[PDB]
């Protein structure tokens, strides 16, 4: 039943927390795969975290409570890459050239 | 009816999403914010937010047993699987508390190196949301007990749920953008 | 049409003019029409007027619509071949194609008043700059205080200034004359009093005199000691000329917030 | 009695503060003075203040913020009294200290006291009925989110007598709104006049977007939803997603001024940048909540008096849909002349200009709405009217201030001063007057006079013409905003007719008491009796007028848009059922303002460093929320005798006239 989907849910954010916390600690040999491996890591966690534990659902509002979040993320997309963009040129500006 | 509150807070979860986007915004333009200070790699000691991870993460799997045990007829099994998330939620308020408190004794904190104020405002900003949900887990458990499982008790237990599992989700980009990134 | 807008002394300020007048002109074809619809049909489809067309169930067109979606973005679509082609041209910290030697002017916002700074003749000023006509000058604008804005209207463009920060601007004169600059952003009680003069002189030979008038002066401004004293709060402040300044002075208000 | 309280706070030796601190307190005792000799305190409770009851709320939201609107403009009218003074060589009163107090307050009262309201009123009242619903989705929500913005409207009215405002405008910009700059307790009655109100803010955009997603009549589908409920499900989502940007970035500010922390400062890397990043990225979509409802608004009025269908349905409704998801990126737009690259400038310049192609699309639909009707010439008609001729004037000078090269020379001037004192005056104030005449019947059951709202209307376009569009000129000439002493002589003989122009648009605000006193004094005379005085064509002139507190005994079945129009069509339009159900309504609760009678304890706490009252203040909030959930005797039925008497002396008002 529904408890598979939480322990499925489990298992793998365990797998998906101590790879991220392991590649840090030891080094890799490589920055750009570290950077790489837990920025992707981080995004299939959250998704975990969203089917198996808030149980997100196309049909759970008759459409709804679902695109609210499709909404949000671009609305959060928006605020964070803009204003870090805006902020970027800003920075590199107003310098000592 | 009970449904209608459960689709209310979840808009305001999506606000409260926006929320906290602002304090990563904000802490991403002063990373390198510091005035002579420590960084993040002489600050971040990731064994010790390794056992932070864990235990909101045993704590969201704890309330997801109490909402199979809410769909059940058990009234006692609610209580027990709420009692052993506050333990895990207060371990985690626990060691953001003394993480604080050694920053601050050490000459580390807010007022100094404003790279550190937006470490505390997000941080912080987190830990008292979860404050902020242990005080509403411990008057949830004070209802069930007296009243018991009625229509109005379980709609408070998946509004929680959803407000519980949320800041799992948060925690998850915090741990990422800060102490990831900030100790590699 | 006498406005310091509508009629401006420098290549920045005549090519905002146009730029102004260009899109006043192209945002004229639906708004005029949009306020002569709001009047007239207003007045021929009055209730009282009984040989009026009356449809009330008619409240969908395709030929119609469309039009309504069109024309509006076809004076946008009109309006994005400027707003590129312009705000890269008229963009500060560039310099102008004149090739004529540009004079750099250092300036640092202070409570209430300006204080200017030439690196290349060694005068500081207080609420008063000079430049040769038809010559580029560079300005390198920041604040020892809270955020203001250099702006001289009748010779084109604004920047703000801020604390810690090295905003730039290029401006040019086509006439001689003085011309008023005043602050832009609000900066406290004082900031109706930090008003400047930009006295555009005929040639070099005029701006000359007035350098060499400048360094008659007995004050100076060879320390970060001598700066504090001038940098108290104060308001209203006349013209005042320093013979001496620091050889790096401009780098020493930036450091002293960003170190 | 401890904090930084010492006496000397109180403005004395000051005769300007000192006669309107005298006038709120002899105004306000003899306000409470006449309720206990009529005895409506206990009328006051239980059926007004503690209501959740949306038309109770949707009122009492209009009374802040018509109450505000005198206070804001009368302030207003004494910058236009300086600035003229000021100007051809004369220092007269309102010292620098003493002005900058001002503007700061009138644009703080203003944005947040009373176009928040009266917009949020105007829903409040409306949109509920026109959806079939017979209450809000969250109706305790709904008391508690009235209550946080008295708590807004208290902290600043003491500002005046206490202490000071702050002195830094009103976004309160970075480091001379710091604790060094700054080190009164101005920017501290920003702060938390803006947090307490914002928190009520967020709570009445949650409430709304549920309520017309989840509240509806069965039968409604989305696209059969009116214009006006279109306009108020795009504004809320704008309330939603912006006001946790102001409540981060006023508490990033507090952290600066009370731990001494580093986010805006210039010393220890702290970025001053950030905060007009921030401050900025709420406050384009903080004024297309403004402006959304006020569209929605002009499209039942002009679809109302023309007697004609709204042209043009689903181009208004894709309108409304692209103007919320354009407003979250052209916020660089307010600070052109920061110092970013031609990339960013041009980015952000061409997609401002994206945004007035919905905005045009509306307006020209209302323009063929009305190219076939017979338009009724109604004071309420007059407003629509007089929003697109002015509208478009303001509107034409955003698009021409969108261009950076021309935000150059006009950032920061009085021709920017002139633009959105355009499009708020003409737009919201208009919007929001044309609402309050056109739902006066059914608010409170009687038409207002038609006389003095066209005169009131007059005065009001006539004297914005005298007022700001010499501010246009002003703003060409190089003046610029706040500027309060030793003005150029230039500028003078422009700012004469510019502070002519508000004693114009102070009668307009004048012949709006006489309106309201002739309407209340003739209610008798001019009584809506069917509940439908206009042409209606929303459900909401389905009802009686005043509403029968539970404004519907059956919910209809929608089938088209313009129900109750095809309902009148159809031919029968008033059917009395063949038997009446229980109505499940919730009950008055004390809860809401204890709350708010915590908050504005903690939060007048917080201001003078009161820290022992901040904490019982902050306990308060708290204790008062946890003891509000062990009620439960929150909802009550409505007996059918009850359903049955109000409906029996509605129906046969219906059959006195014809119907
Ligand atoms: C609710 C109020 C409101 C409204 C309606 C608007 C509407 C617009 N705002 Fe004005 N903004 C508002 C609130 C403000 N904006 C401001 C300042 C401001 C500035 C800064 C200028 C400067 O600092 O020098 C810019 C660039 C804009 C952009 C716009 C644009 C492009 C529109 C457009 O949406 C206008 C759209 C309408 C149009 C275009 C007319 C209708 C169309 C017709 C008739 C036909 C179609 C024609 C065309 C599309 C050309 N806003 C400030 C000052 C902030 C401060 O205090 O510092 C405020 C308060
Ligand atoms: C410092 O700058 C200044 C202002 O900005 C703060 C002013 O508002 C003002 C006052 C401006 C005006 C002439 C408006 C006079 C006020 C009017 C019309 C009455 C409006 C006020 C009320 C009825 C609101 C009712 C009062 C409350 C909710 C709070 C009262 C609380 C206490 C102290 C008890 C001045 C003089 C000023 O100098
Ligand atoms: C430190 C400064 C900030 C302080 C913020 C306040 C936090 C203090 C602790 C407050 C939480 C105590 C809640 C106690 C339980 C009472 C509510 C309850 O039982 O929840 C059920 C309720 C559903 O409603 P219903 O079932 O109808 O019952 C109505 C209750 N009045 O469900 C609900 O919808 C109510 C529960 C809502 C959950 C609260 C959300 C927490 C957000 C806290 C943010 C904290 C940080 C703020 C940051 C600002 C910016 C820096
Ligand atoms: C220190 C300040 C602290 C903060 C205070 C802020 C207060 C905000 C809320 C104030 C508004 C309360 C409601 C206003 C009174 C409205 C009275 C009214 O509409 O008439 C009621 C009644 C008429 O009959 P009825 O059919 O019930 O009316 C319409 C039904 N829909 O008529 C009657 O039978 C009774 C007669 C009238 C009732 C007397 C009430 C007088 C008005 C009260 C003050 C209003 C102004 C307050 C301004 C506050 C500004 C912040
Ligand atoms: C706006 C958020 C900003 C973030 C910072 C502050 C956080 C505190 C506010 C968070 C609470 C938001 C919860 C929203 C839930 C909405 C949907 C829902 O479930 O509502 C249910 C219920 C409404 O109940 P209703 O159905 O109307 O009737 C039943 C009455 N028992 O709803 C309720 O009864 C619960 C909601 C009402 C109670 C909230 C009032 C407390 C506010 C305290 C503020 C504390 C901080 C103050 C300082 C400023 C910030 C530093
Ligand atoms: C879009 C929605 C509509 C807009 C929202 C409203 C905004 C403006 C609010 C002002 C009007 C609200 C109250 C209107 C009540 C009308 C009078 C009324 O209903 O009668 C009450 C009372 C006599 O009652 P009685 O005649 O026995 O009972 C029959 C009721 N038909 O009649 C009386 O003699 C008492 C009337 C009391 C008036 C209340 C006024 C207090 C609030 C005023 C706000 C500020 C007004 C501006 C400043 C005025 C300065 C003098
Ligand atoms: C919001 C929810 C929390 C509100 C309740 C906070 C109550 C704090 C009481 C602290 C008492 C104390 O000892 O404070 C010490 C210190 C100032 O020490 P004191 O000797 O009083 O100096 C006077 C003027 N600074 O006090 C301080 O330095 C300031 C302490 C208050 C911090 C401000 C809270 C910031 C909230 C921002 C949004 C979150
Ligand atoms: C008859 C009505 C009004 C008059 C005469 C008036 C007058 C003024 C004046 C003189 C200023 C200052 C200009 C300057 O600093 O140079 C101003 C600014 C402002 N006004 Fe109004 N105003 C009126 C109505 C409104 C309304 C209805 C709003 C609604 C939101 C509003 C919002 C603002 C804001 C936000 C500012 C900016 C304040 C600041 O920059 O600190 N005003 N107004
Ligand atoms: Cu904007």
Redesign the pocket.
Same mark, same amino acid.
């Given at each position: 039943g529904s408890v598979k989907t939480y322990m499925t849910g489990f298992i793998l954010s365990i797998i998906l927390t101590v790879i991220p916390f392991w590649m840090v600690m030891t080094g890799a040999a490589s920055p750009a795969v570290i950077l790489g491996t837990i920025l992707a890591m981080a995004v299939v966690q959250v998704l975990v975290h969203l089917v198996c534990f808030l149980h997100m659902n196309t049909k759970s509002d008759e459409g709804w409570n679902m695109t609210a979040f499709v909404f949000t993320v671009l609305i959060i997309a928006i605020l964070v890459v803009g204003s870090i963009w805006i902020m970027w040129n800003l920075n590199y500006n107003m310098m000592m050239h | 009816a009970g449904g209608t509150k459960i689709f209310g807070f979840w808009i305001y979860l999506m606000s409260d999403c926006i929320l906290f986007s602002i304090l990563f915004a904000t802490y991403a333009v002063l990373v390198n914010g510091t005035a002579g200070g420590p960084t993040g790699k002489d600050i971040f000691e990731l064994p010790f937010v390794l056992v932070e991870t864990f235990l909101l993460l045993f704590s969201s799997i704890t309330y997801g047993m109490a909402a199979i045990a809410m769909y059940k007829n058990n009234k006692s099994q609610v209580i027990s699987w709420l009692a052993l998330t506050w333990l895990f939620g207060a371990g985690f308020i626990g060691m953001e508390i003394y993480e604080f408190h050694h920053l601050i004794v050490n000459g580390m904190g807010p007022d100094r190196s404003g790279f550190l104020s937006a470490f505390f405002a997000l941080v912080g900003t987190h830990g008292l949301h979860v404050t902020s949900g242990l005080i509403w887990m411990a008057v949830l458990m004070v209802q069930i007990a007296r009243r018991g499982l009625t229509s109005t008790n379980r709609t408070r237990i998946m509004c929680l749920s959803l407000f519980w599992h949320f800041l799992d989700v948060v925690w998850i980009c915090v741990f990422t953008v800060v102490y990831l990134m900030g100790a590699m | 049409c006498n406005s310091a807008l509508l009629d401006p002394k420098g290549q920045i300020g005549l090519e905002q003019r146009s730029l102004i007048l260009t899109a006043f002109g192209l945002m004229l074809i639906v708004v005029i029409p949009a306020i002569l619809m709001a009047v007239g049909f207003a007045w021929k489809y009055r209730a009282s007027n009984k040989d009026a067309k009356y449809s009330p169930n008619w409240s969908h067109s395709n030929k119609v619509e469309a039009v309504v979606w069109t024309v509006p973005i076809l004076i946008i679509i009109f309006l994005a071949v400027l707003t590129w082609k312009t705000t890269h041209a008229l963009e500060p910290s560039k310099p102008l194609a004149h090739d004529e030697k540009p004079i750099t002017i250092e300036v640092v916002s202070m409570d209430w008043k300006w204080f200017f700074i030439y690196p290349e003749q060694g005068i500081a000023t207080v609420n008063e700059i000079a430049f040769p006509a038809n010559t580029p000058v560079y300005f390198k604008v920041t604040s020892n205080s809270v955020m203001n804005s250099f702006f001289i209207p009748r010779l084109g463009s604004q920047i703000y200034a801020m604390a810690g920060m090295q905003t730039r601007l290029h401006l040019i004169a086509n006439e001689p004359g003085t011309y008023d600059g005043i602050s832009a952003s609000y900066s406290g009680p004082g900031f109706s009093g930090m008003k400047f003069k930009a006295i555009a002189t005929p040639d070099r030979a005029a701006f000359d005199q007035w350098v060499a008038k400048a360094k008659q002066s007995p004050n100076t401004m060879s320390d970060m000691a001598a700066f504090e004293k001038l940098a108290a709060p104060s308001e209203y402040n006349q013209v005042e000329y320093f013979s001496n300044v620091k050889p790096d002075l401009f780098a020493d208000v930036i450091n002293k917030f960003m170190a | 009695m401890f904090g930084k309280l010492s006496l000397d706070a109180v403005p004395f030796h000051e005769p300007?503060?000192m006669?309107?601190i005298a #006038?709120? !307190?002899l =105004? =306000?005792l003899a306000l409470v003075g006449l309720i206990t000799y009529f005895g409506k305190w206990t009328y006051l409770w239980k059926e007004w203040l503690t209501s959740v009851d949306h038309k109770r709320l949707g009122i009492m939201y209009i009374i802040v913020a018509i109450?505000?609107l *005198?206070?804001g403009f009368?302030?207003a009218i004494?910058m236009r009294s300086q600035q003229a003074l000021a100007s051809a060589g004369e220092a007269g009163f309102l010292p620098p200290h $003493?002005y900058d107090? !001002?503007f700061t307050? $009138?644009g703080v009262i203003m944005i947040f006291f009373v176009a928040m309201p009266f917009v949020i009123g105007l829903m409040n009242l409306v949109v509920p009925l026109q959806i079939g619903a017979r209450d809000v989705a969250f109706p305790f929500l709904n008391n508690l989110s009235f209550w946080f913005t008295?708590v807004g409207? !208290?902290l600043?009215?003491?500002? *005046? #007598?206490?202490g000071?405002?702050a002195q830094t405008g009103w976004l309160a910009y970075p480091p001379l709104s710091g604790i060094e700059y700054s080190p009164g307790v101005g920017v501290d009655y920003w702060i938390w006049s803006l947090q307490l109100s914002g928190i009520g803010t967020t709570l009445t955009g949650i409430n709304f977007f549920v309520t017309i997603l989840k509240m509806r009549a069965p039968g409604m589908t989305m696209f059969k939803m009116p214009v006006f409920t279109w306009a108020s499900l795009c504004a809320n989502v704008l309330i939603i997603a912006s006001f946790p940007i102001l409540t981060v970035t006023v508490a990033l500010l507090t952290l600066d001024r009370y731990l001494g922390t580093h986010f805006f400062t210039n010393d220890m890397g702290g970025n001053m940048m950030m905060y007009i990043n921030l401050i900025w990225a709420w406050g384009h979509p903080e004024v297309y909540i403004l402006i959304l409802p006020v569209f929605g608004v002009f499209s039942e009025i002009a679809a109302t008096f023309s007697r004609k269908r709204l042209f043009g349905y689903t181009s208004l409704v894709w309108a409304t849909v692209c103007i919320t998801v354009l407003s979250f990126i052209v916020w660089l737009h307010h600070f052109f002349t920061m110092g970013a690259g031609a990339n960013v400038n041009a980015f952000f310049g061409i997609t401002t200009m994206i945004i007035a192609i919905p905005t045009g699309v509306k307006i020209f639909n209302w323009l063929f709405t009305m190219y076939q009707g017979r338009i009724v010439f109604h004071s309420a008609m007059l407003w629509t009217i007089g929003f697109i001729v002015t509208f478009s004037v303001g509107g034409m000078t955003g698009v021409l201030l969108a261009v950076p090269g021309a935000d150059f020379v006009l950032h920061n001037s009085l021709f920017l001063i002139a633009h959105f004192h355009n499009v708020i005056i003409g737009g919201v104030v208009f919007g929001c007057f044309a609402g309050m005449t056109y739902w006066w019947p059914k608010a409170f059951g009687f038409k207002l006079n038609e006389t003095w709202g066209k005169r009131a209307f007059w005065f009001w376009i006539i004297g914005f013409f005298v007022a700001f569009m010499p501010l246009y000129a002003l703003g060409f000439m190089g003046m610029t905003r706040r500027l309060s002493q030793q003005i150029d002589p230039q500028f003078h003989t422009m700012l004469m007719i510019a502070a002519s122009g508000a004693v114009l648009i102070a009668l307009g605000i004048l012949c709006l008491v006489i309106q309201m006193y002739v309407s209340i004094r003739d209610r008798d005379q001019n009584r809506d009796l069917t509940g439908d005085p206009w042409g209606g064509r929303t459900l909401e002139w389905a009802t009686s007028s005043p509403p029968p507190f539970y404004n519907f005994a059956v919910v209809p079945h929608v089938h088209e848009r313009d129900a109750f129009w095809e309902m009148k069509e159809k031919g029968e339009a008033y059917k009395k059922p063949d038997h009446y159900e229980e109505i499940h309504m919730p009950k008055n609760s004390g809860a809401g303002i204890v709350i708010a009678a915590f908050s504005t304890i903690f939060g007048f706490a917080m201001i003078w460093h009161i820290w022992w009252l901040a904490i019982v203040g902050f306990a308060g909030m708290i204790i008062t929320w946890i003891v509000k959930s062990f009620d439960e005797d929150v909802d009550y039925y409505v007996p059918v005798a009850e359903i049955e008497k109000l409906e029996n002396q509605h129906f046969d008002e219906i059959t006195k006239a014809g119907l």
């Open positions: - | - | - | 300007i503060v006669v309107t #006038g709120i !307190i =105004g =306000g109450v505000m *005198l206070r009368a302030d004494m $003493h107090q !001002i307050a $009138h008295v409207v !208290i600043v009215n003491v500002s *005046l #007598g206490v000071e405002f």
